Design a protein around this ligand. Structure first.
Ligand SMILES: NC(=O)C1=CN([C@@H]2O[C@H](COP(=O)(O)OP(=O)(O)OC[C@H]3O[C@@H](n4cnc5c(N)ncnc54)[C@H](OP(=O)(O)O)[C@@H]3O)[C@@H](O)[C@H]2O)C=CC1
Ligand SMILES: O=C(O)COc1cc(F)ccc1C(=S)NCc1ccc(Br)cc1F
Ligand SMILES: [Cl-]
Length: 313
């Protein structure tokens, strides 16, 4: 496999990147250093993750060491929900750039379609526990993202967690200027997203699969929950190929023409997750992994579900 995919903005995106949600701030710097030493060239970030500063320390040291050049790196971040206001989008992007020690992002996403009342709180609630919406819609927020391309802050814009009607609403926006480059959605063998992926790929949007390992460190993990890394069906495919389960979970979206962003702070795992270019899953391996779909989401949130734009009804 070619190591990069061509986007509808003309740039090439490494198909394998490093995730950073939940990476503790005292470990994420070494994580990203090691990642780069062993060959990673794409890092996935977000402001709501609260660790962009520490990610940035690593990026910067490897650039300084001349281990890599900036052009050889592909750095992604996302606009949080309390910043769906015309007047808040740019500042939100800039805070992220500052923290990352960068002067552009390769890609910037609307993290979720729902806007919330702005303020300090990432999730503002009424006295009864409902998120307090913003009256601002996804079309007006998109217009605000387009502006960031046009300002040089970001090389590409995209969406995250948009449903088909919401992607359509974006694509049908009166006066649309830049199509989304990417829709980053949860995707793994238990939420395989074929409908939304085909809709998006048919429209030339590249899909990035998040939580490709099923996010075992998610904070609301319940013991009863399904586990990809421990799914023996998947372990078997791995053994056949003389690879790890994680290596298969990573190679899977790669062969669907997806980008994939597994998270780790463990040095040996970071090296392991990169050794995914010297083997191929067969077609049969691929269909088999697809068959595991159960419409199971890592990422959903009850306090947000009455919001007019909550994506998952
Ligand atoms: N757009 C959105 O709304 C969302 C975006 N994302 C993005 O996607 C990234 C990946 O998703 P995320 O939810 O973090 O979860 P992942 O599916 O990437 O799983 C991460 C977990 O897997 C472990 N792990 C990593 N490599 C291995 C390996 N080789 N063997 C065993 N365990 C391993 C990590 O442990 P350890 O770190 O201890 O090594 C960590 O606990 C996020 O970090 C974030 O960047 C995720 C959710 C939502
Ligand atoms: O969101 C991430 O990238 C990873 O997850 C998170 C990462 C954070 F740093 C803080 C909260 C979340 C949550 S609780 N995310 C789920 C979620 C948020 C908002 C809406 Br609308 C629906 C929803 F399902
Ligand atoms: Cl964010």
């Amino acid at each position: 496999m070619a190591s990069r995919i061509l986007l509808n903005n003309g740039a090439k995106m490494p198909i394998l990147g490093l995730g950073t949600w939940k990476s503790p701030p005292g470990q994420v710097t070494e994580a990203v250093k090691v990642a780069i030493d062993v060959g990673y060239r794409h890092i996935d970030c977000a402001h709501v993750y609260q660790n962009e500063n520490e990610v940035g320390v690593a990026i910067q040291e490897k650039l300084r060491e001349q281990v890599v050049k900036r052009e050889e790196l592909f750095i992604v971040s996302k606009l949080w929900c309390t910043y769906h206001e015309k007047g808040l989008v740019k500042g939100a992007c800039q805070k992220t750039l500052s923290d990352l020690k960068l002067d552009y992002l390769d890609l910037y996403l609307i993290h979720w379609p729902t806007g919330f009342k702005p303020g300090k709180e990432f999730f503002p609630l009424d006295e009864s526990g409902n998120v307090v919406p913003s009256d601002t819609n996804i079309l007006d927020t998109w217009a605000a993202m387009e502006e960031l391309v046009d300002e040089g802050l970001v090389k590409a814009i995209g969406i995250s967690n948009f449903n088909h009607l919401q992607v359509e609403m974006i694509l049908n926006k009166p006066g649309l200027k830049y199509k989304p480059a990417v829709n980053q959605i949860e995707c793994h063998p238990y939420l395989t997203q074929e409908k939304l992926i085909q809709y998006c790929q048919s429209k030339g949007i590249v899909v990035t699969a998040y939580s490709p390992l099923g996010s075992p460190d998610r904070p609301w993990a319940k013991p009863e929950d399904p586990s990809l890394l421990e799914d023996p069906r998947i372990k078997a495919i791995a053994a056949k190929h003389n690879k790890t389960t994680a290596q298969v979970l990573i190679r899977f979206p790669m062969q669907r023409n997806l980008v994939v962003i597994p998270k780790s702070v463990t040095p040996e795992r970071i090296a392991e997750n990169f050794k995914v270019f010297d083997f191929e899953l067969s077609s049969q391996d691929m269909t088999t992994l697809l068959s595991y779909n159960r419409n199971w989401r890592v990422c959903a949130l009850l306090s947000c579900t009455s919001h007019k734009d909550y994506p998952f009804h």
